Amino acid sequence: MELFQTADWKKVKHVPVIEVLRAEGGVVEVKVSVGKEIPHPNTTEHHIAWIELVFQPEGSKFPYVVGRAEFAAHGASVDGPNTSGVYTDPVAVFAFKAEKSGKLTAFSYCNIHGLWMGEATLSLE
Ligand SMILES: [Fe+2]
Structure with a gap:
């Protein structure tokens, strides 16, 4: 019954x-994880392969890839x-260094x- 909304644990x-760890003076550290609240398997048959981070500062027409992390070992x-x-x-x-606040998008x-x-949002406060 779609009268009753819910949440999918698998999502x-x-x-x-x-998670933004710091952002004072444009010196930024951002942590990204998968399976924080609800652990995701890490076996040879089933695992998360990578995470990529994108940042688009406000006033910038285009987004920038900040970086990419591959997770290579699975037993x-x-x-x-x-x-x-x-x-x-x-x-x-x-x-990374940043001069302005803006939008973070992560992919995995x-x-x-x-x-x-x-x-998530990055507020340089
Ligand atoms: Fe999975």
Whole structure:
């Protein structure tokens, strides 16, 4: 019944969550993660592959890619899937200089669950 709204935990599990760690004087650090509130698997069969961060300062006609983080290890070795002991967590910190406030957009990818997007505001206060 569409009278009753709800929330999908699977979306929460995949969405890239943006947290501004500092922004004083245009020295900015932004953390992006997937599966913060609700852990996302990291196995050889199922994992988050990367996160990319975009920033568009106000007054700027075009957006700029700030950077991209690949998460390369997911437990595979010559001994089989999930045996290597090495798993890269889908968390990244982007450090950058900025002269103005503006909009952040993050993108991420799961190898079986498609492409994902998230947004937040950067206030240089
Ligand atoms: Fe997934």
